[PDB]
Structures are given as C-alpha cells and as structure tokens.
C-alpha cells in the first residue's frame, strides 16, 4: 500500500505541475441528451464523431461560475481531475473552453447515480453497502494521500459502472491543501460539524461524510434530515444519532466512530489513519486487494441496452447551448 501510493504520488505531481489545456472543440461532438444537473453546471451525453465514442460533457457557463463565486474551484476541479488516476474516479478525456463556456469531456458512466437506485430499492443490505463503502475507503486513502480533499460525497455524485463498481464524479469542490481550509462547501446533509461551525477543517470532513453515506445506504435515509437546511445543520451539531433497529452492532459502532463530533476522536483522523477503518470489525471479510483489483462479486449490475443507452438517468429539460460573438471572462479563466 504505502508502496503503491508512493509511485502514485509521482504521476499526479507531474500532471499537477503541467496540466493539459484545450484538447478538443465543441464541433467535434454531437449533443445528445442531458444526463444530470447540478447547482453549477450540466452534463450531457455527447458523441465524438471522428471516433464514434460516447462521453459525458460537463458544461459550465462562464458568467454563472463568476456569479456563484466558483472561479477558483472550477480551476481546481479541472486541474485536479486531469491528474488523478484511480480505479474509482471518472476519467476526464478532453477539456476546452469557448467565448461563453468551459467544457470537461469525461468518460460516460452509464450505470446511473447510486441515488436513483438507492431511492429505488429503498435500501441496501449491509453487505451490498460494505461493497461500495469499501470502494470509497480506498478512494479517500488515495485522494488524501495526494493532500487532496473531495468535500462532496453524496450518492448524486456517485456513478455505477458496467460492472457494479463505483465511479466518483463531481470534483467541483476538490482541493489540494496541506493545512486547514475554511470554505463553506458541501451538500447540507453531508456537512461535518466543524464546517457548519466555521472552524477551520481538514480531511476529517471526508471521513464524517463517509459515515453519513454508509448510514444512508444501509438505512435508506440520512441520519439528519429536515425540510430546510438550517434545521439540518442544527441536528447535525446536536451530536445525536439514532440507529435503525436493523443495524448490526458492528455497523452501529463503526458509525459511532465516524460520526464523531469530536475530530480528535474521529476514525480516519486518528493515529492509525485509515487503518482504524480498514481494520474495523464490520470490514472483516473485505478483501481490500481483490476489491482494488475489481475482482470482487458485484452485488448489483445495472443493465444497459446498447452504447449511448440512457435509461439509467432521469429525463431533463433541454437547455440549448449558446456561444457568444464576444468573449465573456477571458482573463479569469486564462488557465483552463
């Protein structure tokens, strides 16, 4: 492991240092359907005409980005995504901008969002959840190892591959930081106490969000939910958690350690690092390696009928794409 990561650190760095720019043009793709949406941008199923391959195009309106103050985060996102390389992260194929927008062309993860399935089935069995969990674990250990923070773990941000494996998308909040950071970033239900507390934070936030994830997947709902955000933040800080009756003691306990309000008591943020987790009872049958190798028994497999089949995503109103005669915010995005 330490071994692997070692080698891993070098790739990243090289890419980190010399990030790629404008590897394609709008024209070289055919707009198909809209796969999903977010607070910032949109994702369309696109098709590379010269190749015949499908991909996922993320469009960001330059002006909209500026208005929501996401100039620095966007740059991070593109910068971070092009350099990482892990079996559970989406692949960014191309990137380019135009007079009005920013584009990131990624591999298309057909399986759909874990969200849709989860909300579908209503809940995942302990073992099925442990499968995903296990994958997220390795992903953070990898990310954290590159001094990176993901800060936006949610089922809406997790895609299912053709093999039942996890593809992590949305690197919009990703940040390379040695030290504390203070931005209020996330998704309400996944926010860690210290974030909502405007107290300065680190990687431990990724760990908290993981407990929230495992909980939701196993329970079928979040540990803290209300109708408006402020009410959530409030429950989240109360420091009280309730577990469903069908949660093995093992589960209950791991979660106890992850949903630890006190960051010096937080699994992942302790002495034994990620080992505290990997070593946890609930994880006693998990073959970390087989998993990394994608050699494990995938509980569920989304089935898709034909390349470019979008049955695993919801339907979205098609906004049309628009490029202006004049450049909008050139300087601000000089490095994309």
């Amino acid at each position: 492991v330490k071994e692997f990561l070692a080698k891993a650190k070098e790739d990243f760095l090289k890419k980190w240092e010399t990030p790629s720019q404008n590897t394609a043009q709008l024209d070289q793709f055919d707009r198909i359907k809209t796969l999903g949406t977010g607070s910032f941008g949109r994702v369309m199923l696109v098709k590379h005409k010269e190749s015949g391959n499908h991909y996922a195009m993320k469009i960001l309106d330059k002006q909209k980005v500026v208005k929501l103050k996401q100039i620095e985060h966007t740059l991070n996102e593109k910068r971070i995504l092009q350099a990482v390389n892990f079996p559970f992260l989406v692949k960014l194929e191309f990137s380019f901008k135009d007079n009005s927008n920013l584009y990131m062309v990624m591999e298309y993860v057909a399986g759909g969002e874990m969200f849709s399935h989860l909300r579908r089935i209503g809940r995942f069995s302990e073992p099925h959840a442990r499968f995903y969990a296990a994958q997220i674990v390795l992903t953070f250990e990898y990310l954290h190892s590159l001094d990176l923070i993901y800060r936006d773990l949610k089922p809406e941000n997790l895609l299912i591959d053709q093999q039942g494996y996890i593809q992590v998308t949305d690197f919009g909040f990703a940040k390379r930081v040695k030290g504390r950071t203070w931005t209020l970033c996330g998704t309400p239900e996944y926010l860690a106490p210290e974030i909502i507390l405007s107290k300065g934070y680190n990687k431990a936030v990724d760990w908290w969000a993981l407990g929230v994830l495992i909980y939701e997947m196993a329970a079928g709902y979040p540990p803290f939910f209300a109708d408006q955000p402020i009410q959530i933040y409030e429950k989240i800080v109360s420091g009280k958690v309730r577990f469903p009756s069908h949660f093995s003691s093992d589960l209950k306990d791991l979660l106890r350690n992850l949903l630890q309000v006190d960051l010096t008591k937080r699994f992942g943020n302790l002495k034994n690092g990620v080992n505290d987790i990997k070593n946890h009872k609930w994880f006693a049958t998990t073959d970390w390696i087989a998993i990394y190798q994608r050699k494990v028994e995938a509980p569920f497999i989304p089935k898709f009928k034909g390349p470019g089949d979008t049955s695993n995503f919801d339907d979205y109103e098609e906004e049309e794409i628009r490029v202006s005669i004049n450049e909008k915010c050139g300087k601000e995005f000089t490095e994309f």
Partner: peptide, 20 residues
C-alpha cells in the same frame, strides 16, 4: 416511522451543492 417521516419530507429528491 422514520422512513415514513423521510418520504414525506421535502428533501427526497436530488440535492444540489451549496454555494453562496
């Protein structure tokens, strides 16, 4: 029940990220 409680809440759909 909790589940019942959740399903009638206003946050069952997809949740967007927070910003300003």
């Amino acid at each position: 029940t909790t589940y019942a409680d959740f399903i009638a809440s206003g946050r069952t759909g997809r949740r967007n990220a927070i910003h300003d």
